[PDB]
Structure formats: C-alpha cells, structure tokens
Paper text:
The 70 KDa ribosomal S6 kinases (S6K) RPS6KB1 (S6K1) and RPS6KB2 (S6K2) are key effectors of PI3K/mTOR-regulated signalling, and have been implicated in a variety of human diseases including diabetes and cancer. In order to generate a more robust crystal system suitable for the generation of high-resolution protein-ligand structural data required to facilitate S6K inhibitor design, we decided to develop a S6K1 chimeric protein based on the catalytic subunit of the closely related AGC kinase PKAα (PKA). Our PKA-S6K1 chimera was created by mutation of five residues in or near the ATP-binding site (F54Y, M120L, V123L, L173M and Q181K) that differ between the two kinases. Co-crystals of purified PKA-S6K1 chimera with PKA inhibitor peptide (PKI, residues 5-24) were successfully grown, routinely diffracted to between 1.5 and 2.0 Å resolution, and ternary complexes with inhibitors could easily be obtained using soaking experiments.
Residue numbers in the entry:
A (entry chain A): 13 to 350
B (entry chain I): 5 to 23
Amino acid sequence: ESVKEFLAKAKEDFLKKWENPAQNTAHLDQFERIKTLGTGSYGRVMLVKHMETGNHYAMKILDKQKVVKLKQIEHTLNEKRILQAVNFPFLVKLEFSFKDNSNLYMVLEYLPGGEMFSHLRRIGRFSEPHARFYAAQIVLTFEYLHSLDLIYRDLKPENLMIDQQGYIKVTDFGFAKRVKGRTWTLCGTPEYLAPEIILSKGYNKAVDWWALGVLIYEMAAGYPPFFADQPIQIYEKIVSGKVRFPSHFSSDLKDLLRNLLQVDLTKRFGNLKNGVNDIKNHKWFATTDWIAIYQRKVEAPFIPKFKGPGDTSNFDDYEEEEIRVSINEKCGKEFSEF
Amino acid sequence: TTYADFIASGRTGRRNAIH
Ligand SMILES: Nc1nonc1-c1nc2ccccc2n1CC1CC1
C-alpha cells in the first residue's frame, strides 16, 4: 500500500518532466576533458571536470551523423527524454545535456568505483548474499521503471556502476522506451535477450524480468546461462528451453531462476497477476529487507577503494580521439527536441 | 568445466549491444 502511494507521487514527478523536458543546460566549453572511460556502440564516455564547480562527471558523446547512419535517432531521443525525467536511488543521474553542430552530449554523475562487470570478471563470481544484494536493487529499479510504463531493455553487468557506498547505479538508457502496449524492436545484448525478442514477437516489460534471471545467474555462477563464441549459437541456446545450473547454486536460487528464465510468458515471474510480488516474496529473498535496501541502510558486501573523485584506476585505457565540432550544423531537424 | 569453457570463449570481454 505504501509502495502504491510512493509510486503514484513518483509518476506525478516523472510526467511533469516527461511532458516538458530540460534542454541545453550546459556547453562543451564549461568542461575540461580528462580521459576516455569507454567506447562502444553507445559512442564514447569521457571523464570531464566541470570548471565552475570542480565536480567530475562522465560525459557520453554521440556523433549525430553516426546516430543517423545507425538508425538510432528515436532511441537517442528516448534515452535523453527518459533520463532527464527519472529520479530513483539506483539510477545514474543526468546532470546536464546539450548539443553542438556535430555531437550530442549527456553529462552524468561519475562513479569512480567502475562497472560491476570489471569486478565480477576479476573476482570470478559473487556469493549468493552478495549477488542477492545487487539483485534486490535491480528488482526495486524495475518496479519503479515499469510503473512509469518504461522498459529498460539493456540489463547487463557492463551497465551497472558501483557507487562509493557499494550500491549500484543503472546507466545506459540507450534502448529505454516508454510504451503502454507491446513493442517489436530487436535490441539488447545477445546473452540477455528473452526468447520472444529473438523470435521477432511483440514483447513487453517481461523481457526485463528474463534479463534479471540472466544477471542473477551470471553474478552467482561467474558466467552467463547461455554463452558461445557467436550470437547465433547463443540464440539457439536461449530458445531451446534448457538451462544448466552449477552444483553450488542453492535450491531457492535454482527455483527463482527457473521462474525468471521461463520461456512461457503466462508462467514467467514478474509477468503474473501478482506482478513484482512473486519475485519479492520468493524464498531466495526471505532475508531481504526491501525498505532497508531502498533507504541504503544495508551494509554493502563490497566497497571500491576510494582513490579520489577523478581517479580512473577502475577503468581500462582507450585511444584518445579528438572531439571534433564542425563549422556547419549537422542533422538539425532530426535532433531538434534534444 | 563450464568456467574453463567460458574463459576460453571469445565473449569474456565487454559485450556490445545489438540492434
Ligand atoms: N556514469 C558513469 N560514471 O563512470 N562511467 C559511467 C558510465 N556512464 C555510461 C553511460 C552509458 C554507457 C556507459 C557508461 N558508463 C561506463 C563507462 C565505461 C564507459
């Protein structure tokens, strides 16, 4: 009942910003370029210093011409529109957004603790209580996002940052979409795709619950439930209706994962009449105090070593490329609302 | 072991999104 009340007020706040988005809140000249944190299909993320405050931020840079070539215009507009409107403890904050002749810029809070991905690969795997701690934060985040009619569509350890208190922040809203009915875009990461996406069906928020099953399995095993050298071989594994669990997985963990990694939509947890409560009330989460997680009162199982607000030791090294700004405006009409 | 199979695979690094 308090969840319904909290979400009702959360929806009112969201809808005001969704209907009247913040636009052009900074300029490139207000930032000092420090280091490239990463490059991917998401363009590039740069560590920057905001000169007026001395604050460090992670600046996502997208080339307008490349977005157009990749047919990602609508997805990029969704990303910025959604990010500027949301407000949740486990979501990365969009601090500023702007564009120039060549690029789009999204300035986000910087998490020097780095991606869950890097820590997970290095350590190998997380114990069940450690994995449960992160999984509970995802459960609350999807409960929040789904109540706003938002589908996330890109859950993976690469998209989960570890904050200075050991809690997570979901980043990368590149495929996030506000949709009341079903949708059809083939998007996401091969290992995390629900069978309904692979089989070109209309799908809904249940794909995020399947992706949660893949994440929990990956955190607890150290490898994903479906892996192979090529995406096609991964797709065949996903649709086969077969999953194998390590012998160290508890009975409760296996039961929860068979209900999340469920090919049948009428049977998938998160998608039934009781919605998110089928997950929250599962035996694997019996020790989880949901309010205490939300309030960040639970002691985190792992805290990244603090080496300063601008330290990059948790990120890999990338070739440093220029930020070129053409003298001519590119794709003006396409990115008018950004 | 499955761990050894994963480690020897080409997909242990950061995975790119598809569209
Ligand atoms: N916030 C962030 N604070 O440090 N890194 C952040 C981050 N924000 C992102 C938004 C989109 C995609 C990747 C992102 N990363 C991870 C970097 C390795 C690329």
